[PDB]
Subunit: 499 residues, 4 copies
């Protein structure tokens, strides 16, 4: 006998006891007489159109694939619940935080960023950690990563950043020139690049890394008072990372290391968990913060803004069918219930649009009707209708226009968003020159120790060495801006690689 | 007060009892606070991306439409049941005919042919009369028309025929030159054209016309014996047609005449019904038939092949949501349960491919998972997986390959198709001259009387007059081939027009 | 010999002189030996999968249709040019207005609003009048209507308004209750309703109606100075409308009356033209205008803001293939070149998102690559890549990320948008009660005369009579709010109708 | 200076030197002022819907991905020419073989089979080797592999086979139970499995392997005479394979080894070539062949059917944009010009349908209009029209129905397919027992030597050891049927593995 993941089929068979196998049918439900031999004219004659068993099956096979996620294509999913352990109702009226002991079902998907569906799990890259809470007030999607920050601070640079991390448009090869030219030209990336090339760049599976909302969000209480916050979900299994050596080995040995690690852990009752915390910053404090409180390349020092306990995230259920439950999972940062709102963070603002948008393309206009994406703990009632692949009853014969005099769904003023005053010109304000080095300096010499600083520089050099010399120079200049030694150590390694 | 159709909303509100209106939500289930005013900075300021209530709703509105059916786009639907009244098990082992009194739920869609979704119901055109039987052996789709024959006998001419009946590729206008150039060049169309321009060309609604499978089909019994057949479902409401004058009036007064007529008939309890019959031809008989038994431009004389009663079709339920239940309805001639099979009819053979093919395009790869199309009376089990908008559980974790040693779905030898012998070279046999006038002559001279013939010729000439003279001549020549008087009567009217 | 439209094919043939017919091929370019007879085993045998001539052609036929436009589905198109006749460079720096005599190619599509693709042209409804200018600074899409105003003033009510003007979700029938319940609940619609039910509700074809941008826009000159404007393009053919009786008759005699009239006019050299004017309002004046200058239900009095001539629009070319050049035509209000920008108009703001969004759905992600939609007079260069149906070279091997050090495209500061100042809270400001009667009263009493008011009320009553009494009462109540007589005249007709 | 592939951007910049960078525009051609900072109200304010530069770019990014190929997803492409070297016009009248020295442009795509888009190039798996010939008689697609045979002989087993080779439905992990359960239950796979697990299972890049049509095809000469044939294209750069150890290290060091190798070879002028040969078998010989001459699990012995030289395939041009020219490449086995036809091979018959079908889904209905897929050396002219993303002029105003009296395209009888006679009942003939070992014995004992035979068993055991014992037993049983020592050697290693 072997690991549970390996015995997937064996277990499916034994669980079907002595039940006779079902009758094999066409998509239309017609029993099939023989699905192993095609309908031909004579033993060695041509195939007939009349063989609709063949066409029915082949036509479906021909349409099995859907486009992969534009980013975070390689991933793993699991399900479980969220449980409130502490009272934060003074900050947010969100039903999900309603009362201690309150449980809400959740869906989670882990993933890498740049690699396609067939890529390896154990590679250096940020890690997606999206959590879907099916609440009474609809779904709340906390689409986070294994890092509290990111490489850029304005959504207009996202497509270009992703492109630079992907393949060359002509050769279809990973291109260090594209990678470092972009990062060297955009030093705001220094903070996350430092995180990326540290030990945390390659977590050991998905159970040994933390999750972060990254962005500054807004919480609103029952009295309509608002504060800004940040979400943190620390792994209860402890932080564990893979060495560059073992990561590379597993890259070919088991491209799906993260997938099987998670499935087996849950299958054996070793359910992984995370503790959800929040940091709170009042509007007054946000106006005095030394940097842009809504700058995604910045963190909120824990000493000034301590973590507040909220609850626990537990994954105790594996998907039964990956494609249906994980490949089709759709997380939308715009999916926020009353009590939780976005901040003016330029990046988050862009994500408000991008996710539902790419989902309408990747899955389809009615992707929210796919079981895993349905807010099944809520009652979806509105004036939206039709669209391709419309399931259910399309809200039946209910009046489809609002307002109406026929008792159809009514909006609820209780759900109105919190109001903030803004004053300024409609312009494209430059954020390229906000502080790009201060917090990186503290990360380098305060957060990391001597051994991980050495590893950090070797990891960077090992990749930067493949870029052109003028790019290497520019990149080293930025690192030096953070700290002379940071750049010096990298430069020293580059001179070696450069023979 | 008013007719049931007009009081649709009034009724929905009443059936709603005095319930409180549901809370209006986004597609994600999030309650909306005010869905009548957009989120802006200041009363006369710009719209925010932050307004996700707006985007959610507008994006779905922007995707409401799907491609209309390439043909038969304008239609009406209803639901009911098929009840067996006679025993024909000696001919077919199909479970649908299993025992007297057995009822099978059905779905039916009526339609015109050439017009697009916004066209009028009361126009001269054949009428679609598709019936979906949800049987224990899967769905059986009998996709018939209100005529036992058709204009052509080879599917390769179908796209061209339809193009000729639709809009000119440049002007987007109906084109009599296209219509008659095609018909005059393909005389095999004379039989259906005669029927089309007779009074039956414009039935009074959908309840006063007969239905026909048109094609010759094959029935197989428990002993594996087979016979050919024709399906006939006669209106119990009686044949009734609209005069050209009334149809033209209704065309603008109520372009949805047929839709309204059917909804109200059912809503008032005046359920329309049809009596299903079959004609049976043994294989020996098919070998001696004066024409090709599988030629779609010909009928089987009732005198030589008497109608055998089978059961009744009753429509007693209106759709609740038209888009979900009627617009998305998909009938596939290839959906046939054991006991019912196709004949060599070249046209039918082409249809075996065409419908599932167009449905995967118009609806989606997984169109059979749409509620109204699901064979909900059968257990769908096979090795098909994934595809866009994959609902349910995608068959969970069941082994997905066949054969397998894990108890997944299995054949069913009894379902094997009836084996027939065919001999001959594989080539394109010309069927253009398979007698295009004999049966047309009997229709013109015996089926119709004097006043009917006069109207028939007046209807033809009224439309053919707009074609070029050379086309008029070629058309008249064909009619003359059916009968000299047929031609001269039309010619005399044409001369009066060409004045 | 008939009209040009009727002789479309006749002319195509004559055009090919003695030139020999092309060889008929498959989509893959393989010559076809016989496209009239399918490949079978014996003259009365089954169809073979081997007949790839059949499958290739049928598979395409099965995919001919695309989703029709969610609104304005029924239309006609033509091409021509825009010629500058006056200098307005003091207001806008747009290249399209660069110098007197400058010509810019244009594409125009006329249409109704509610009817689907098969509906009739001569029905009461607003008329779409979209103009695409292919300028050196990209495409400028002025998506106007034949009216200066609209039914609503906030985009959140648009889907609802459209739903109310379309078919009942259960019966699929036009619904007077839906139409009037919505309008009676939203009095802001009074202005456009009065316009819609006046003689201008049914123009005589597309050449005898004016065009308007409707919304207030912003013009920016070379010195960075800005002013608000309104676009007006008056028909040089004169205003001409159809009587209700003639329109009803044509509804069935020629559903494509508008299409035919436009094609023949151009084919005979009787090219239609419109004179383009603009109204100008300074930011100072906008500050004290009696109404919200960005309220789409309001017009700017010509007495206070006279029309300033700009140029002429002339249509002198008929499309060659309707599907490729008209059905696939896509206009995005967001397509605005430097010198032209949007105003705060909530409705216009919503349209900035909706059109490109619906186009990605209806046509495809790369719909801007469809020839008629390509900004062929500009050099498209950016960092966008891939997507389905990617044509041309997909920008070859050019660096695909910005910024870069490899000489790829650069943004141009001179194209920066004009900066406007805004201040206020972020909230949903109610605009439901922004004076819904003042201008309506002026229209009713001044713009119209006794004869015109008589028909107006008869037209309204003729439709409103089919709504429930409680809806009729509320509707009449709003009309009385405009003017007592407006409501009483309608009420008198209603009483007669209700018996 | 590095390899050409690495200097892709460097070179693009240089070859553009002496040119000012282009203006960065939106998709609509509107120049952008600042594509690096989003439009907000105030420096730290909300993102505006008015930022259409952002929406236009992000919306396109959100739609960059299309479904990957259902199989053969990971690949590399290149272009070149086919040059005739010998005269085979006695066998085929195809224009592509017309005269010695004649050149026809070609497009080629190499690939693995099971892995997704992000998978490694150097893994054990068959290799795709598809060639598209742009001939004057349309495109001819020779969709070959690097092996002359395949695992199964009936298309109905293909989807199951591919499913067994891919990921487990629930775990999403490679599953040896699925792999070997299928192969052990279907011993016809022994021949190809033996080839797969031999040294040829992991080619050193794409230049050091052969290509085969695999299937028996049919050639028809100018006199209407036909013969059956096999296509063979041998590498001119010699057969070379990767050791299991080196392929494994390359899997993580360079997962795109094959792409890189091909691009650099061509970039440096080391153009790879292959010699195209054919084997000929007369209809008489096919009647007495010791096996089914159309059985894909069989080869035609060279001794009895020697290879006849035809021409050379030379690749001398790299793609300029991978996505447009390679990812979108579509090869349809059904694309065959006059002189080349299919054989009764059950697998080929199925492929005639599957490729165009999957292409309509993966790429779109009009995928043949994508530049790289267009039969640009031919003249496409037919009666097909419209469909989404319709490019070109959609054949303008040409009559769209056939037959017609207006001089539109006509079929050419000389292109009629060769006629063949087939006798026997039309039914599903079992082919599961068509000698599964005879040629496998020859391969094992005669083709391979002791060393490679040793590695063969080690390779099989290394993978088979992960399957359940009952599956191992059945698998070994099959190998023993080929030759007791074959199964014996594997069982020995298996025992050591099972420890
Ligand atoms: C009944 C058997 C088979 C079926 C139904 C089948 C089906 C498919 C499908 C659906 C694709 C994806 C096409 C695309 O998306 O572009 C594909 C690709 C491919 N198949 Fe098959 N296949 C079969 C057998 C084979 C055989 C025997 C060969 C070789 C002689 C072969 C060689 C290939 C190649 C090379 C490609 C990749 C083409 C490219 O590079 O785009 N297939 N096959």
């Amino acid at each position: 006998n072997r690991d549970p993941a390996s015995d997937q089929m064996k277990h499916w068979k034994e669980q079907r006891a002595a039940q006779k196998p079902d009758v094999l049918t066409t998509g239309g439900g017609n029993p099939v007489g023989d699905k192993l031999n095609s309908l031909t004219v004579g033993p060695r004659g041509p195939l007939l159109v009349q063989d609709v068993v063949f066409t029915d099956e082949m036509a479906h096979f021909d349409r099995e694939r859907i486009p992969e996620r534009v980013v975070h294509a390689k991933g793993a999913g699991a399900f479980g619940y969220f449980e409130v352990t502490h009272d934060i109702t003074r900050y947010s009226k969100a039903k999900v935080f309603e009362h201690i002991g309150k449980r809400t079902p959740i869906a989670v998907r882990f993933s890498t960023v740049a690699g396609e569906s067939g890529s390896a799990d154990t590679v250096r890259d940020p890690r997606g950690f999206a959590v879907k809470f099916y609440t009474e007030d609809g779904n709340w999607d906390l689409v986070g990563n294994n890092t509290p920050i990111f490489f850029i601070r304005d959504a207009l640079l996202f497509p270009s950043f992703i492109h630079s991390q992907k393949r060359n448009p002509q050769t279809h090869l990973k291109d260090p020139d594209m990678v470092w030219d972009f990062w060297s030209l955009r030093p705001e990336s220094l903070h996350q690049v430092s995180f990326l090339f540290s030990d945390r760049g390659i977590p050991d599976g998905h159970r040994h890394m933390n999750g972060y909302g990254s962005h500054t969000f807004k919480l609103v209480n029952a009295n309509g008072e608002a504060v800004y916050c940040k979400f943190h979900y620390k792994t209860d299994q402890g932080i564990k990372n893979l060495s560059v050596e073992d990561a590379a080995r597993l890259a070919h040995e088991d491209p799906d290391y993260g997938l099987r690690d998670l499935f087996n852990a849950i299958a054996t009752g070793n359910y992984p968990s995370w503790t959800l915390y929040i940091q709170v910053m009042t509007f007054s404090e946000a106006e005095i913060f030394p940097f842009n409180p809504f700058d995604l390349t910045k963190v909120w020092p824990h000493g000034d803004y301590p973590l507040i306990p909220v609850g626990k995230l537990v994954l105790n259920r594996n998907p039964v069918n990956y494609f249906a439950e994980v490949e089709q999972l759709a997380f939308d940062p715009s999916n926020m219930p009353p009590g939780i709102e976005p901040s003016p963070d330029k990046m988050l603002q862009g994500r408000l649009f991008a996710y539902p948008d790419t989902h309408r393309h990747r899955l389809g206009p009615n992707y929210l009707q796919i079981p895993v994406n349905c807010p099944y703990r809520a009652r979806v009632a509105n004036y939206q209708r039709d669209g391709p692949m419309c399931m259910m009853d399309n809200q039946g014969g209910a009046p489809n226009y609002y307002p109406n005099s026929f008792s159809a769904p009514e909006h609820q003023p209780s759900a109105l968003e919190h109001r903030t005053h803004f004053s300024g010109d409609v312009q494209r304000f430059n954020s390229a020159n906000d502080d790009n080095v201060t917090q990186v300096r503290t990360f380098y010499l305060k957060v990391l120790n001597e051994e991980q600083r050495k590893r950090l520089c070797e990891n960077i050099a090992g990749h930067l060495k493949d870029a052109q010399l003028f790019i290497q120079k520019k990149a080293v200049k930025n690192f030096s801006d953070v700290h002379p030694e940071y750049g010096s150590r990298i430069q020293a390694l580059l001179d070696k690689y450069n023979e």
